[PDB]
Amino acid sequence: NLPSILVPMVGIVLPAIVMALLFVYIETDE
Amino acid sequence: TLNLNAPTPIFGGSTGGLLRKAEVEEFYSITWTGKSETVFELPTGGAAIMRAGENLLRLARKEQCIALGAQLKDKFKITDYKIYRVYPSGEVQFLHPKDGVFPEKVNPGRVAVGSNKRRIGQNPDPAKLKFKGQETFDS
Amino acid sequence: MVQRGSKVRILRKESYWYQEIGTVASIDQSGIKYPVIVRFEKVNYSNVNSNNFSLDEVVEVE
Amino acid sequence: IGHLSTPISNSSAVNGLLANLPAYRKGLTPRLRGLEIGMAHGYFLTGPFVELGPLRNTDGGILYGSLSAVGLVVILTACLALYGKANFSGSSKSKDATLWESGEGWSDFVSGWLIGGAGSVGFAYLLLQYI
Amino acid sequence: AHTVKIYDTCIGCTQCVRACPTDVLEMVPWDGCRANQIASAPRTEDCVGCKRCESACPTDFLSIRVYLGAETTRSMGLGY
Amino acid sequence: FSKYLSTAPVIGTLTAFFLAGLLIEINRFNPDLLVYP
Amino acid sequence: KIVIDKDPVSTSFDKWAVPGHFSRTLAKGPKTTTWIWNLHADVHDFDSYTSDLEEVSRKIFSAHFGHLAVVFIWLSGAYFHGARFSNYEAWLSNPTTIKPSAQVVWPIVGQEILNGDVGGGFQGIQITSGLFQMWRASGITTELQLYVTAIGALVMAALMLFAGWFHYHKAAPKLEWFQNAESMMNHHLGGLFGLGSLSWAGHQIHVSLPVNKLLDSGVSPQEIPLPHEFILNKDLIAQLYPSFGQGLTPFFTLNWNEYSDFLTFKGGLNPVTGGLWLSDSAHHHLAIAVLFIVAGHMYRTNWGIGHSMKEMYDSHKGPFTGEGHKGVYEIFTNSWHAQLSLNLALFGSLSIIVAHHMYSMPPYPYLATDYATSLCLFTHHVWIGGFLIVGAGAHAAIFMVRDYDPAQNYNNLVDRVLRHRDAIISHLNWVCIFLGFHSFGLYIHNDTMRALGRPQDMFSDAAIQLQPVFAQWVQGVNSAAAGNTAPNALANASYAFGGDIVSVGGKVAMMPISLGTADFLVHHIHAFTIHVTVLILLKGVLFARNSRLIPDKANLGFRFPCDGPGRGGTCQVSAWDHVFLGLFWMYNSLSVVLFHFSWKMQSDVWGNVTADGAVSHITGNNFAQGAITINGWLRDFLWAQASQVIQSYGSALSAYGLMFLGAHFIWAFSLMFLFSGRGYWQELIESIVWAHNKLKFAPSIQPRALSITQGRAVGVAHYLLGGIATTWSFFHARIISVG
Amino acid sequence: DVAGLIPCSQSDAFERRLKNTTQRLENRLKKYEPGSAPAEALQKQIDKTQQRFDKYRNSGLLCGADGLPHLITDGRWSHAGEFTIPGLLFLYIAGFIGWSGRSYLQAVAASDNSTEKEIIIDIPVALQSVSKGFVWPLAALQEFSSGKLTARDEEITISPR
Ligand code: CLA
Ligand code: CLA
Ligand code: CLA
C-alpha cells in the first residue's frame, strides 16, 4: 500500500537526505 | 611593544570576558600607567584597581579598549593609554593612538582616505550605474 | 552679491530647509568654500538653526 | 585573568568525573571512546519509548518501543557525520588535535558510536522483555 | 566592512571623530585654506555602523556618511 | 495668576469643558435631535 | 537631631507660567512639538535635572504628602458616595440579595438604563469594590457616619496638602535628617505599624465587635446602639462577652485568660456571615501591635543601645561572598532609586499575598458569598501587584546606570553579582525554556491527543497523571493542624486546605480547592511566565551599565531608544526597553493567573449549595477534564463565559459590553505603535506640514514625529489599557450575571 | 418611496418597538412603590421614549421592515433635513474652528516669538483672531482672489527627489 509506505519516505526519509545535503552545501568553504 | 606579560590589575572574576574567540582569532589589550590605587568599572563587570604599573588587561574587542580610554581620561585624568591588537593570533599592534598623538586632534602627514569631493545629493544616481561596478557613493 | 542681514531662499535640494526663507548671519571673507552662514526661523531634525551655504546657493528675496 | 575564582570552581571531586569520562580521557583511541559513549547513551534511550509510547500495553511495547531507540540513534550518527562534513572540511588542523578539535578519527568516532548505539539498545530490550 | 565617506562640507568641528566608539575616524589637514581640517576614515574595517558619528556632525546634512556594507566578525562586535 | 490660565493645558480643558457643556444641556433640553425639523 | 532650612522657596504663581522651570534645556521654549513630550516625561524625574542630593530629597518628601492627599480625596469620594448615592442602609437590612450599588447615573441621553433594578428602593450601578463589607466590618450602621468620614477625610486631605507645602516651601529638612534610617525604622514600625493595629484593635473591640456580633444575631441596623454608647454604658457592652465588668483589671494583673471571650483564637469562618471571626482579628491586631512595637525598639538612636545597620552588614560575609554586605547600607542611604525598587517589589508582592489571603480567608461579612466582589479584589490587587514589580525592575535598573558606584562597591555583593551575570542569566535562560516546554508543551501534547481522539495519551486524571504531590502534602498538613500543632485553633487556618464546606444564604463561602493534574498543569505555567518576567527584568538591571556588545551603556542613559543598526542592529538595548518588554510579559503572567483563578472558583469552588447538602457549582466541574487543553480553555472558559458580556445590550450591564468592545479597540490601536517605527511617521508630517504651509497658517512650533521610546511607551500603555480593560469588562459582566 | 421604505406613520414596523420598550420598563416598574424616587425615573423614561416616537411619526421618516429610520442622501429637498441641513450647520461651525486658528497663527507668527504663543493662548490675539473667523465665508473668498490664501510652490518646503 503506497499510503502506508510512501508517507514516511517523503515525510521523513527523503527530508532526512535533502536537509542533510542542504546543510552540507552550506558550511562548505573553498 | 606590548611587554607581555605586564602585571594585570588584581581582579579575580568576570564570567563575561575573553572567551574562546581569543584562543582562535584576534584578542586585544590596552596599556596605561595608573597614578593612584583607584578603582574603575571594567567593560566586563566593575572593579579592577589601577596599579602603579604597567597596567595591562586583555579585553575582548576594539570597542572596549576605546570605551575604556574615554572612561579613563574623564574620571582619572590619565591620557597615557596605549591600546594594542595582538601577535600571532591578531593583526596590528598599537592601534591607538596611531600617530602617537590622539587622532581627535589634527596633525601633519595624515592621509584623507574616504573623502568624497562633493555633496551627497551630488552623488551619482543608482539609475546611472546600472550594471556598472562603480560604487555610487565612491569617487 | 549677498551681504549679511539678508533674506534668502534655498536651492540646496539635499537640505531640510530647501526653498525656505533664511536670514543670514555672516560671510567668511576668505577662500573657504560654502561661506554663507544662514540662520533660519525654523529648526531642523537634529536641532541646528544655521548652516553654511554657498554664494551660488543663496538668493536675494528682498 | 579570564575566569572567576569561586570556592567551588575547579574542585577535585567533580574534576575526577570530568577528566575520566570517555570523551576527555587520556589514552583511548577514537574508535573505542565513541563506543563507551554509544554504550552509555543507548542503554537509557529505550527507557522513555517503552513506558511512554503510542502503544504501551501490548505484546509489543518493549519490542516496538526499542525499535525507536535504535531508530533514534541512526538519526544521531547521521547528525554526527553531518557535523563531520561541516566542521572537519578535510579535518583542518587546529590547536589540540583531539578527537574534537582536529578530526582525524571522526568516522571512527561515528562508527564507534553506532556499535553501542545499537548494541546497548537491544541489551535493555533483552533486560526488559526478558529478565 | 562598512563604507564611510567624508564630504567636502566638513567644517572641521571635530565632533564626529570624538563620537566614534571604535576609533575609525580622524581629522586630517585640509589644503583648501591650510587652516581647517577634514575628517577621514582610515580604519573603515572597524566601523560597526553604529552611526554615532553622523549624529555629531552639526551641518544641515552630514559631512560624514555611513553606508552599511559587507558584515564581518569585527563589525558585528562579537566577543565570541 | 491669570497668566497660568493662559497656558496650553488649562485652556485645552476649560474650553473642552463648556463646549462639551453646550452639547449636554441642549440634549437634556431638546432630546433626540436626529432630523432637522 | 532635626535640622531645617526655613522657607527656601516662597509662594509664587509666577513660575506657573513657565513650564520646565525646574530644568535647564526646557526653561527656554519649544522649537519642535516633541518638547511637549520632552517636558511631560521628565517632570517627576527628580534627579534628571537636580544635582543636589539634599534638595532632590526635599521634593520627594513634599510630593508624598500630596500623594497622601489625593488618596484622602479619593477615600472621601468613596465615603461620600457611600452615604448619599448608595443603598447602604438598605443593604444592612438584607445582605444576601441586594447588590452593593453606588455611582448613580444622571438621567440623560440613555445611560439611565445603567441605574438598573439593583434592590432596596434604589437605582444605580452595582459596584464590586467591597466598601459595603468594609463598612459593615468597620461597624457603620447609619448613613451619617459615612458623611462625617468624608469631610473627616477631606480635612485630612487638606491637612496633608498643607503639610507638603509646610515641609518644602516653609520648613525644608536636611539630608542628615533624611539619612537617619535607623530612627526611621524605629518609628515606622513603632508609630505607624505598632500603633496602627493597636489603634485598630482599639477600634475593633470597642466599636466593631459589639455591633457586628449583634448583626450576626441580626436584631436590626436601627436597634443596634451607636458606637459611642459602648464606652459610656458599662452595662450595655458587658451583656455580650462579659469581661468588661472585670474592666482592665485582668489586663493589669497579667491574668489575661479572662479575655477568652472577645480576644480569641476561633479560627474559621463565621458561619452566618462567611467572614473571619472579628474576635480573632482583634486578637490578631493586638498580637501584631505588640510584635511591631517590640520590633521598633531595635535600631540605634541617640540613646546608645540598638542595632546599627552599618555594623550588621559588615560581619555578614562568608567565604562564597567575599566582602558580603559591605557598603550595601551605604547604598540605601545614598540612592532613592535603589530604595524605590526594593520598596516596590515587596509592595506589589505583598498585594498578591493580599489577593491570595482574601479569597481563602474572607475577612469580611458577606464578601465571601458575594461572588461579584470576592473575585474583584483578587484580580485588582494581583494587577496592582504586577505593575509594582515591573516598577521594582525599573528603578533597580535606574540605580545601576545613575547611582551605582564601583568605587565603593569592590568585591561585595553587587560587585560579585555583576561579575557573574552571565551565569545568572544563562541558567535563567535555560530554566525559562525548560519550563515552557514542560508546561506549555504539555498543553500542545494535550491539544493533539484530544484532536487525534487519543484521550489515553493526553495528560489528564484518567490518563497519564501528573500529580501535584507536594501541593497535596502541603494542603494536607495545613488542613490537619487545628488540634495537632495549632491546638487552640478551633477549626483550621482556612477551609481552602481541607474540611467541610460553609454556606451563607444559599451560596458557598469556602470549600477545599482541590489540586489535581489540571492544577499541576497550570501552576507550572505561572512558574514559567514569572521566570520569564524575571529574566527580562533581571537582564535589564544587570546589563544596564555595559555588556559584551556595548561597553558604555551606562553613558547612554537609562532611556535611550537604540544604538543604531550597528553590530547587526542594536534596537532595544536599553534598560527602559527591558521594562517596556517585561510589561507585556507581566500582562501575560498575570492574565493567566486570573484565568486560572476565575475559572477554578466557578467550576470547583463557588456555586449554589442544596438544602440537601451537596454543591452544584457554576461552570460545573469542567476544570478537571476541560482545562487540560487550549480548546477547552478557549471553548469552555473564554467563549462560553463571555456569553453574558456580549449579550449585555439592553440591560444594566450594557456599559460593560461597550467597554468589552471598547478595550478591544484600544488594544488594536496599540499594535499600530509597536509594529511601526519613527522614520515612517516622520515623513508623513513632511507632506502634511507642506500642506499647512501651503495655506499660509503653519505653526511656528514645527511638528515632528514622536520619539521612538514614546512610540514604544504609547504602544505598551494602550496595549495594557486595551488588554486589562477587556479583562476588567469580561470579569465584571460574567460574575455579575452568574453571581 | 425612494428605497423601499414606508413613511412609518403607518408602519407596523416602527410600532413594534414601542410596546416592547414600554413593556420592558413597566415590568421594571411593577415591583416599585408608586411614591418612590426610581418610579419617576421609570415613568418619565417611557415619556422620553414617547416624545421621541411622536417626533418621528410627524417628521416623515422612512422606516423599513425593521422599524429603523434610514437616511437617504442623494440629497433631494424632500429628505433634505436628514443630512443636508445638519451638513450646512456643520460646515459653518467648522470654518469657525477653521479660520480662528488660521487667523491666530497668522497673527502670532507675525510677532516676535510665536513658539511661546502656541503654549500661551493670547486673549489679546485669540479674541482678535475669532473676529477674523466670524467673516470666514466672506474672508477666504477675497483671500483666494487676492492670492494671499495660498503660496507658490517655491515658498513651500520641498522634500528631495
Ligand atoms: C510526516 C512524516 C511522519 C510519519 C510517517 C510519522 C510517523 C510516526 N510518528 Mg511522527 N512526527 C513527525 C513526522 C512523521 N511521523 C514530525 C514531523 C513530528 C514533529 C512534530 C513528529 C512527532 C512525533 C512524536 C512525538 C511521536 C511520533 C510518533 C510516530 C509514530 C507512531 C506509531 C508507532 O510508533 O508505531 C510503533 C512503532 C515504533 C515505535 C517503531 C516504528 C519504526 C521506528 C520509527 C523506526 C525503527 C528503526 C528503523 C529500522 C530505522 C529508523 C527509521 C528512520 C531512519 C526513518 C509513527 C511511526 C510517536 C512514536 O512512537 O515515535 C517513535 C511519537 O511519540 N511523531
Ligand atoms: C501583620 C499583617 C497584617 C494582617 C494579615 C492583617 C489582616 C487584616 N487586617 Mg490589618 N493592619 C495591620 C496588620 C495586618 N492586618 C497593620 C500593620 C495596620 C496598620 C497599617 C493594619 C490596619 C488595618 C485597618 C484599618 C483594617 C485592617 C483590616 C484587616 C483584615 C482585612 C484583610 C486585610 O487587611 O488583608 C490582609 C493583609 C495582608 C495579608 C498583608 C499584610 C501587610 C503587613 C504590612 C505585613 C507585615 C509583614 C509581616 C511581619 C510578615 C507577613 C508577610 C506576608 C505574609 C504578609 C485582616 C484580618 C480591616 C478589618 O478590620 O477587617 C475586619 C481594616 O479595616 N488592618
Ligand atoms: C504565543 C506567541 C509566543 C510564543 C510561542 C513565544 C515564545 C517564546 N518567547 Mg516570546 N513574546 C511574545 C509571544 C510569544 N513568544 C510576544 C507577543 C512578545 C512581545 C512582548 C514576546 C517577547 C518575549 C521576550 C521579551 C522573551 C520571550 C521569550 C520566549 C521564549 C520562552 C522560553 C520557552 O518557553 O521556550 C520553549 C518554547 C515554547 C514553549 C514554544 C512552543 C513550542 C512547542 C510547544 C513545542 C514545539 C513543537 C514541535 C517540536 C515544533 C516543531 C515541529 C516541526 C519541526 C515538525 C519562547 C520561545 C523569552 C526567551 O527567549 O527566553 C529564553 C524572552 O525573554 N518572548
Side-chain angles (χ1 to χ4, degrees):
Chain A
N1 358 247
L2 298 332
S4 94
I5 280 278
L6 291 209
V7 287
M9 306 310 170
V10 72
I12 290 174
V13 190
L14 182 143
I17 294 309
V18 57
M19 296 266 298
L21 274 296
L22 282 166
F23 165 72
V24 160
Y25 173 58
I26 291 167
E27 266 72 13
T28 37
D29 54 65
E30 185 85 325
Chain B
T1 304
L2 190 54
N3 194 5
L4 200 66
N5 282 278
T8 54
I10 179 67
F11 176 65
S14 168
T15 70
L18 202 84
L19 65 97
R20 179 248 166 190
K21 180 184 151 272
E23 66 196 8
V24 55
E25 66 255 15
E26 195 184 309
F27 79 103
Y28 283 75
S29 277
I30 174 156
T31 318
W32 79 99
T33 58
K35 259 74 87 176
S36 283
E37 274 278 296
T38 64
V39 186
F40 44 89
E41 185 206 346
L42 286 194
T44 67
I49 269 158
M50 58 178 50
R51 319 277 215 101
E54 296 305 272
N55 208 293
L56 200 147
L57 192 89
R58 304 168 194 81
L59 282 185
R61 288 154 43 207
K62 216 185 164 218
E63 189 162 10
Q64 326 202 323
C65 291
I66 303 301
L68 169 63
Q71 198 197 318
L72 281 179
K73 189 208 309 192
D74 209 314
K75 304 207 146 304
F76 316 117
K77 288 298 163 273
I78 41 168
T79 330
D80 61 293
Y81 58 92
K82 185 184 193 300
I83 80 166
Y84 282 81
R85 161 152 89 186
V86 305
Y87 188 51
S89 199
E91 192 153 270
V92 194
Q93 329 298 322
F94 189 57
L95 290 182
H96 173 265
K98 202 55 190 295
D99 287 337
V101 79
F102 326 110
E104 77 266 9
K105 205 47 186 49
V106 198
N107 165 78
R110 319 170 154 178
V111 56
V113 176
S115 157
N116 262 301
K117 300 285 179 66
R118 290 170 300 189
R119 318 186 297 124
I120 316 174
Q122 282 179 358
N123 264 313
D125 286 335
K128 261 303 291 179
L129 303 183
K130 214 186 309 190
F131 312 98
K132 188 187 286 185
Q134 175 208 346
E135 280 209 299
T136 291
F137 40 82
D138 194 79
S139 164
Chain C
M1 187 221 82
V2 175
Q3 84 291 338
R4 50 191 197 89
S6 158
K7 291 172 69 174
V8 299
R9 293 288 175 86
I10 303 304
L11 313 100
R12 167 169 276 211
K13 213 183 272 276
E14 74 177 13
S15 69
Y16 168 61
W17 287 305
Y18 168 67
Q19 283 174 357
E20 289 201 328
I21 310 103
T23 68
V24 296
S26 161
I27 311 292
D28 193 284
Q29 307 276 340
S30 68
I32 177 169
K33 57 187 72 174
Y34 310 79
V36 193
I37 306 140
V38 193
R39 195 168 319 270
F40 289 84
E41 292 282 323
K42 262 186 164 190
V43 195
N44 75 315
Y45 293 99
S46 298
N47 292 341
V48 308
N49 214 22
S50 43
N51 194 44
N52 297 113
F53 281 83
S54 293
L55 287 161
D56 316 334
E57 284 183 353
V58 302
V59 210
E60 205 53 47
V61 45
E62 183 181 351
Chain D
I1 328 290
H3 322 99
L4 78 165
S5 311
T6 71
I8 67 163
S9 189
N10 320 318
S11 43
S12 84
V14 68
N15 230 330
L17 213 76
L18 191 139
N20 288 113
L21 269 194
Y24 272 84
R25 221 182 288 197
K26 186 60 69 182
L28 308 186
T29 165
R31 196 48 180 262
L32 196 146
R33 80 171 70 254
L35 176 65
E36 205 174 342
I37 289 173
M39 289 180 49
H41 296 68
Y43 173 74
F44 86 96
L45 264 173
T46 170
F49 286 119
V50 307
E51 290 223 4
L52 308 164
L55 75 173
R56 294 172 296 271
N57 321 95
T58 59
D59 187 284
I62 303 105
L63 184 25
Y64 301 22
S66 167
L67 305 180
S68 39
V70 60
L72 186 65
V73 172
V74 298
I75 324 290
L76 303 174
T77 175
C79 275
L80 279 180
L82 310 168
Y83 182 83
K85 302 193 218 183
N87 214 43
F88 305 138
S89 297
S91 58
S92 288
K93 321 294 169 149
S94 41
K95 186 174 74 174
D96 186 270
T98 327
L99 175 50
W100 314 91
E101 279 204 357
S102 299
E104 165 261 323
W106 184 256
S107 279
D108 274 312
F109 172 58
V110 158
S111 44
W113 150 264
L114 197 42
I115 292 287
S120 49
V121 167
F123 169 77
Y125 161 67
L126 177 67
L127 270 181
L128 287 165
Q129 190 70 79
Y130 313 111
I131 307 109
Chain E
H2 302 317
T3 72
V4 188
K5 297 310 215 179
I6 296 81
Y7 290 86
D8 283 22
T9 53
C10 177
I11 65 166
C13 75
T14 81
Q15 256 349 270
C16 56
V17 70
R18 301 223 198 91
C20 184
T22 59
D23 179 25
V24 167
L25 319 164
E26 66 194 7
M27 304 307 312
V28 310
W30 193 226
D31 308 305
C33 176
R34 273 81 193 252
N36 48 75
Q37 40 264 21
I38 195 168
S40 192
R43 293 171 288 284
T44 57
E45 73 274 359
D46 296 324
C47 182
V48 297
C50 65
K51 274 161 183 264
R52 284 180 184 184
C53 55
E54 308 179 329
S55 296
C57 189
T59 76
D60 190 49
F61 217 51
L62 304 169
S63 292
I64 186 167
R65 194 93 168 79
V66 184
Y67 311 83
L68 305 174
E71 294 283 340
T72 181
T73 174
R74 286 175 192 174
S75 181
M76 292 287 276
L78 310 185
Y80 55 95
Chain F
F1 164 69
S2 276
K3 188 71 176 178
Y4 164 69
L5 270 300
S6 47
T7 76
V10 285
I11 211 161
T13 182
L14 283 176
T15 70
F17 162 75
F18 150 75
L19 270 294
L22 176 144
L23 284 198
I24 183 176
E25 299 286 345
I26 201 151
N27 278 260
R28 175 208 189 183
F29 276 175
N30 316 328
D32 297 71
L33 312 176
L34 164 59
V35 196
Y36 199 92
Chain G
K1 205 50 75 171
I2 306 105
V3 295
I4 303 101
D5 307 65
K6 289 306 290 285
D7 191 357
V9 286
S10 173
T11 76
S12 91
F13 282 92
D14 310 282
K15 298 184 77 69
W16 289 40
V18 178
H21 52 265
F22 45 82
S23 68
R24 185 59 245 170
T25 183
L26 318 176
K28 305 293 296 177
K31 312 300 284 196
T32 45
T33 194
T34 82
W35 181 97
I36 308 163
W37 315 119
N38 284 88
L39 180 75
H40 270 53
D42 288 32
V43 182
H44 299 151
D45 219 325
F46 278 172
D47 207 77
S48 85
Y49 46 89
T50 297
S51 82
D52 189 85
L53 189 63
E54 176 184 359
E55 166 54 46
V56 78
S57 59
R58 295 164 167 173
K59 296 161 147 41
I60 294 165
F61 188 92
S62 200
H64 291 171
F65 277 129
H67 199 290
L68 280 169
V70 62
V71 187
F72 273 138
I73 306 189
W74 162 71
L75 262 195
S76 47
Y79 279 99
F80 199 86
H81 292 222
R84 170 70 164 88
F85 309 107
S86 304
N87 43 356
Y88 186 70
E89 197 80 18
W91 182 70
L92 303 191
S93 68
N94 167 47
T96 303
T97 79
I98 307 178
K99 297 316 254 175
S101 179
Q103 195 210 324
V104 183
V105 191
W106 273 332
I108 206 168
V109 300
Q111 38 189 68
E112 49 86 21
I113 203 170
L114 311 184
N115 289 331
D117 269 14
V118 57
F122 195 77
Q123 272 189 6
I125 298 187
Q126 161 186 335
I127 73 152
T128 171
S129 201
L131 305 169
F132 274 31
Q133 298 87 352
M134 207 193 52
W135 296 327
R136 192 196 157 84
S138 277
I140 292 182
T141 69
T142 81
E143 286 188 358
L144 181 78
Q145 300 147 318
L146 277 164
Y147 190 96
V148 62
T149 55
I151 297 310
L154 263 175
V155 301
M156 206 50 196
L159 204 163
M160 281 296 185
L161 190 62
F162 161 68
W165 173 84
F166 180 84
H167 274 286
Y168 184 56
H169 284 222
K170 188 89 185 301
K174 292 186 67 63
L175 191 75
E176 66 184 50
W177 180 94
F178 276 128
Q179 281 172 264
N180 260 280
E182 314 95 358
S183 171
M184 199 180 295
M185 289 278 308
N186 274 0
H187 293 83
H188 278 110
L189 271 159
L192 179 70
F193 280 141
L195 312 169
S197 67
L198 183 58
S199 75
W200 190 253
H203 184 97
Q204 188 160 342
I205 297 148
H206 294 322
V207 175
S208 306
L209 277 177
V211 310
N212 281 104
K213 181 159 280 287
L214 296 174
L215 258 171
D216 305 341
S217 45
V219 41
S220 185
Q222 305 93 346
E223 278 47 55
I224 280 176
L226 268 82
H228 66 266
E229 311 189 274
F230 300 92
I231 310 145
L232 278 180
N233 270 12
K234 279 293 300 161
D235 53 276
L236 179 60
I237 171 66
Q239 294 296 108
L240 70 164
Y241 36 87
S243 291
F244 292 99
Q246 259 171 338
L248 293 174
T249 53
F251 186 74
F252 270 103
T253 186
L254 269 296
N255 187 24
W256 285 355
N257 199 250
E258 278 297 322
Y259 300 152
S260 298
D261 50 339
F262 67 96
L263 201 81
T264 66
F265 216 106
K266 298 190 75 156
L269 290 189
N270 196 342
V272 52
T273 62
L276 285 181
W277 277 104
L278 292 206
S279 173
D280 289 1
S281 173
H283 191 200
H284 176 68
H285 287 103
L286 196 52
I288 292 310
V290 188
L291 184 46
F292 284 169
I293 285 171
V294 310
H297 301 93
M298 178 186 170
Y299 298 99
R300 192 160 297 180
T301 40
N302 47 2
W303 289 285
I305 54 162
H307 306 259
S308 76
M309 291 158 114
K310 206 174 152 278
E311 194 175 320
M312 258 180 296
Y313 283 142
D314 305 333
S315 52
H316 267 107
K317 32 197 178 190
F320 288 81
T321 36
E323 301 308 284
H325 305 88
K326 199 268 294 175
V328 155
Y329 169 76
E330 300 157 2
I331 289 302
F332 286 86
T333 75
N334 271 302
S335 293
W336 279 112
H337 281 113
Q339 261 292 339
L340 186 48
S341 49
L342 190 50
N343 289 2
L344 269 169
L346 301 166
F347 211 75
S349 297
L350 182 64
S351 57
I352 312 175
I353 297 169
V354 182
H356 273 76
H357 289 179
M358 272 185 44
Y359 81 102
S360 46
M361 283 156 313
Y364 296 135
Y366 310 108
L367 173 131
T369 46
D370 186 73
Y371 308 146
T373 318
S374 67
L375 188 137
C376 286
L377 308 158
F378 191 112
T379 174
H380 169 81
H381 291 126
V382 161
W383 261 128
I384 305 304
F387 274 116
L388 307 170
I389 299 169
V390 176
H395 299 269
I398 301 156
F399 163 71
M400 299 301 301
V401 284
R402 298 195 293 173
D403 303 343
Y404 161 82
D405 207 324
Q408 286 81 246
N409 298 329
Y410 169 71
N411 207 2
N412 67 319
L413 294 197
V414 193
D415 195 351
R416 283 165 96 92
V417 166
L418 289 201
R419 283 203 273 115
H420 83 293
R421 65 181 173 194
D422 290 328
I424 321 170
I425 278 298
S426 62
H427 291 74
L428 184 46
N429 186 292
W430 167 77
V431 70
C432 284
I433 302 177
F434 169 80
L435 272 171
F437 280 141
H438 297 88
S439 75
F440 170 66
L442 295 192
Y443 275 77
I444 300 304
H445 179 99
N446 276 351
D447 272 30
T448 295
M449 304 313 125
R450 271 213 203 280
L452 299 180
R454 317 159 60 185
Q456 55 268 353
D457 264 6
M458 53 173 196
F459 286 107
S460 164
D461 266 322
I464 324 177
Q465 283 159 88
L466 300 164
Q467 269 294 281
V469 287
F470 305 122
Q472 279 160 342
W473 173 62
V474 165
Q475 203 190 9
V477 71
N478 282 322
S479 81
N484 287 357
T485 66
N488 312 346
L490 276 74
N492 280 312
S494 86
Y495 302 131
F497 301 105
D500 66 327
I501 66 173
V502 283
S503 173
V504 165
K507 303 214 274 152
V508 49
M510 212 50 200
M511 59 170 303
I513 318 164
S514 43
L515 312 174
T517 52
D519 290 296
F520 173 89
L521 259 187
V522 59
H523 265 92
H524 278 62
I525 309 164
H526 301 327
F528 165 64
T529 64
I530 282 164
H531 270 96
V532 188
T533 315
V534 163
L535 163 78
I536 306 148
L537 283 163
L538 196 66
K539 185 167 34 149
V541 187
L542 292 180
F543 289 101
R545 295 199 52 89
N546 45 357
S547 316
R548 287 178 180 87
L549 201 72
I550 307 110
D552 45 34
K553 209 195 288 220
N555 262 335
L556 297 157
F558 159 71
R559 193 183 46 214
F560 69 102
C562 71
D563 208 357
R567 317 155 190 87
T570 45
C571 290
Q572 312 184 349
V573 281
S574 68
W576 185 89
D577 300 34
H578 290 107
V579 192
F580 155 73
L581 276 192
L583 271 157
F584 313 89
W585 258 97
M586 180 265 319
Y587 174 74
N588 179 43
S589 281
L590 302 196
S591 46
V592 68
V593 164
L594 312 177
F595 278 6
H596 179 202
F597 151 74
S598 45
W599 195 16
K600 178 75 181 151
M601 301 296 279
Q602 291 167 28
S603 67
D604 310 81
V605 181
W606 293 334
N608 290 320
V609 56
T610 74
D612 294 333
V615 186
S616 75
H617 302 101
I618 317 180
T619 324
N621 279 269
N622 78 323
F623 201 80
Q625 303 295 325
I628 57 175
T629 76
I630 311 300
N631 202 358
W633 266 95
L634 192 71
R635 169 189 47 238
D636 287 279
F637 172 63
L638 273 196
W639 173 79
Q641 304 181 358
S643 62
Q644 275 92 330
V645 61
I646 48 182
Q647 289 189 346
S648 85
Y649 274 27
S651 170
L653 316 191
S654 315
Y656 297 106
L658 289 199
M659 293 270 301
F660 181 57
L661 270 169
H664 271 98
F665 179 60
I666 307 173
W667 189 88
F669 188 53
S670 42
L671 262 66
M672 189 154 138
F673 297 95
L674 309 154
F675 295 170
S676 88
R678 180 172 192 276
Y680 172 83
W681 296 92
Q682 172 60 65
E683 296 171 337
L684 210 54
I685 313 300
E686 307 173 14
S687 90
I688 275 174
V689 79
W690 182 98
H692 285 53
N693 282 265
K694 175 62 188 172
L695 308 183
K696 281 199 183 179
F697 67 101
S700 82
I701 287 171
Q702 54 149 358
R704 285 261 170 275
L706 311 177
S707 40
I708 313 156
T709 65
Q710 199 211 345
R712 280 165 192 161
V714 78
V716 62
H718 283 76
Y719 197 96
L720 301 171
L721 174 58
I724 303 152
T726 321
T727 295
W728 181 93
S729 318
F730 168 50
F731 278 17
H732 276 81
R734 168 66 168 161
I735 78 190
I736 293 173
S737 173
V738 300
Chain H
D1 311 308
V2 304
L5 319 99
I6 179 159
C8 69
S9 201
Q10 318 302 100
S11 84
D12 71 321
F14 188 69
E15 194 50 46
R16 286 179 282 102
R17 317 299 261 276
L18 205 169
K19 56 99 174 180
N20 39 309
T21 64
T22 194
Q23 286 296 96
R24 282 186 293 110
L25 305 157
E26 271 149 358
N27 285 63
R28 208 172 140 208
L29 184 50
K30 287 293 184 183
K31 307 316 288 169
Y32 277 161
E33 272 65 15
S36 91
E40 60 92 9
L42 296 201
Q43 277 166 347
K44 207 169 306 166
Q45 158 165 23
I46 294 169
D47 307 338
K48 291 256 182 46
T49 80
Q50 188 208 309
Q51 49 85 20
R52 158 173 79 229
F53 271 37
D54 297 62
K55 196 188 185 148
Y56 290 168
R57 285 162 171 173
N58 288 307
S59 82
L61 285 172
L62 286 185
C63 299
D66 51 358
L68 281 181
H70 299 166
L71 318 176
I72 305 93
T73 80
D74 49 347
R76 330 187 196 200
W77 298 85
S78 53
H79 282 103
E82 301 210 289
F83 163 64
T84 80
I85 322 292
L88 56 90
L89 189 72
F90 171 72
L91 196 41
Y92 177 70
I93 306 173
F96 191 30
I97 314 287
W99 202 263
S100 304
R102 195 265 193 279
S103 68
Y104 194 87
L105 263 177
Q106 262 165 312
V108 289
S111 298
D112 206 311
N113 216 15
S114 161
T115 84
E116 181 51 49
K117 295 188 174 301
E118 313 212 341
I119 297 182
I120 45 158
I121 296 285
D122 312 309
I123 312 166
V125 192
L127 199 51
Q128 204 78 25
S129 307
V130 286
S131 63
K132 305 175 260 301
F134 261 111
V135 198
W136 87 268
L138 283 159
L141 302 189
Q142 60 181 358
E143 200 77 21
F144 166 65
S145 49
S146 51
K148 271 276 311 190
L149 192 147
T150 77
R152 306 178 179 254
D153 301 343
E154 291 105 12
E155 275 73 25
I156 326 292
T157 169
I158 294 179
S159 62
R161 292 95 68 100

